[PDB]
Amino acid sequence: ADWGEVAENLQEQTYNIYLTSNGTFRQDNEGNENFNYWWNAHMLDVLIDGYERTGDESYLPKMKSLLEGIEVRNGNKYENVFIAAMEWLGIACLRTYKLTNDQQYKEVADLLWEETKQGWSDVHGGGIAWKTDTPNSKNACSNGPAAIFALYLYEIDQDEEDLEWAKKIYHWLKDTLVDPESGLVWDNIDYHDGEAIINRDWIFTYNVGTYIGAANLLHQATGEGMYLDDAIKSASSVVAPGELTTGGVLKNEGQGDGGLFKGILVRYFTQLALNPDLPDGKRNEFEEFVLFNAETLYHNGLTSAGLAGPNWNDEPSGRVDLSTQLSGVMLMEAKALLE
Ligand SMILES: OC[C@H]1O[C@H](OC[C@H]2O[C@H](OC[C@H]3O[C@H](OC[C@H]4O[C@H](O)[C@@H](O)[C@@H](O)[C@@H]4O)[C@@H](O)[C@@H](O)[C@@H]3O)[C@@H](O)[C@@H](O)[C@@H]2O)[C@@H](O)[C@@H](O)[C@@H]1O
């Protein structure tokens, strides 16, 4: 079984176990049919991964049923009070539009982009708010994805205003939430009792992952070497022993939201690994890091059926949330893409 076949087996198991009403995916493989908007946005990204790997046109109807189901199970609308939810679906919509030219995806993305920009304010000097409800909380997870969103939109529409947005968001993110020594990414800045407080304890895989993804896309959009340097510094900190790994493997971040975090990192990490201006030596290091994570999950973390747990070193003994399964599928599709 080569890495493409492993990826296809995890795509099949995910669809089989989690497919529910309206072509959307359920919260867990046990008693929870809750609709989780951003988790289903990452399921769309996973189906696109399968389509790109296979060229199999049977993915396209699955993608379209999921796009339409999200609107139904979110209450017959695409708006969400969580701004990052709208950013993650926007990214998947523009990715699909680039591959299929299906205008329905572009129209949903255009809507979600207007809502995302409304979240920007000069509180803490910039940044998109986490929620339409929490305008003091500026979070890495509502900024890194907004920069990626703007860069995908720039690739499609070639409007200078979208590149301006990407640069402004990235500049604020790097000036506020990026460790200048490591290039790892702090979770948020918020007010408490008159003080601006940065949460430096919460260093999560997906926040450094979207910073790496934005930096990689900015390098490709501008040619400015500072962006590729930033991406390489952050990625080198992900591979070197430290906060995000245990025994050379991306660490257990629990289930729920945290279950998706590692998958997002692997996706953009892998995109940096495919940048043709990346030095050959760094490319070998990054490709080997992805392979050892993929091998670890395949041999030690996956159940016989092909469900991944939060710990890629251990099989899960009970419930597996969709988020956790998606991280597993994203890892295998990234490995298959590097082959
Ligand atoms: O114990 C808290 C939390 O800790 C870790 O996550 C860190 C994370 O928390 C915050 O954001 C969570 C997500 O918010 C948005 O999704 C909204 C989504 O949340 C749940 O899935 C449900 O309530 C859904 O109904 C709802 O729509 C979005 O921004 C997403 O990207 C976020 O991850 C926030 O403080 C972040 O800055 C921070 O990174 C994990 O252990 C987690 O499982 C845990 O609950």
Author numbering: 53 to 391
Extract from the study:
The marine bacterium Salegentibacter sp. Hel_I_6 (Bacteroidota) isolated from seawater off Helgoland island (North Sea) contains an α-mannan inducible gene cluster with a GH76 family endo-α-1,6-mannanase (ShGH76). On overall, ShGH76 exhibited endo-α-1,6-mannanase activity with a preference for linear α-1,6-mannans. The tertiary structures of all three ShGH76 variants indicated a single-domain protein with a classical (α/α)6-barrel fold, with six α-helices forming a core that is surrounded by another six α-helices. Multiple sequence alignment identified the aspartates D136 and D137 as catalytic residues in ShGH76.
We generated two double mutants, D136A/D137A (ShGH76Ala) and D136N/D137N (ShGH76Asn). Tests with ShGH76Ala showed that it could indeed not hydrolyze Man7. However, ShGH76Ala could still bind yeast α-mannan according to affinity PAGE analysis, whereas dot-blot assays did not show sufficient binding to yeast α-mannan. We hence repeated the dot-blot assays with structurally modified (linear or debranched) yeast α-mannans. Both ShGH76Ala and ShGH76Asn showed binding to linear yeast α-mannan, with ShGH76Ala exhibiting higher affinity than ShGH76Asn, as assessed by blot color intensities. We solved the crystal structures of ShGH76WT (apo-form), ShGH76Asn (with Man3) and ShGH76Ala (with Man4) at 2.0 Å, 1.47 Å and 1.9 Å resolution, respectively. The ShGH76WT protein formed crystals belonging to the I 121 space group (Hermann-Mauguin notation) with three chains in an asymmetric unit (ASU), whereas the mutant protein ShGH76Ala crystallized in the P22121 space group with one chain in an ASU, and the mutant ShGH76Asn crystallized in the P1211 space group with one chain in an ASU. Despite repeated attempts to co-crystallize with Man5, the crystals of the double mutants ShGH76Ala (D136A-D137A) and ShGH76Asn (D136N-D137N) were only obtained with bound Man3 and Man4. The terminal mannose of the Man3 and Man4 ligands adopted a kinked conformation so as to occupy the active site, which has not been shown in GH76 structures. Co-crystallizations with Man3 and Man4 show also a kinked position of the terminal non-reducing mannose residue that is unknown for any other GH76 so far.
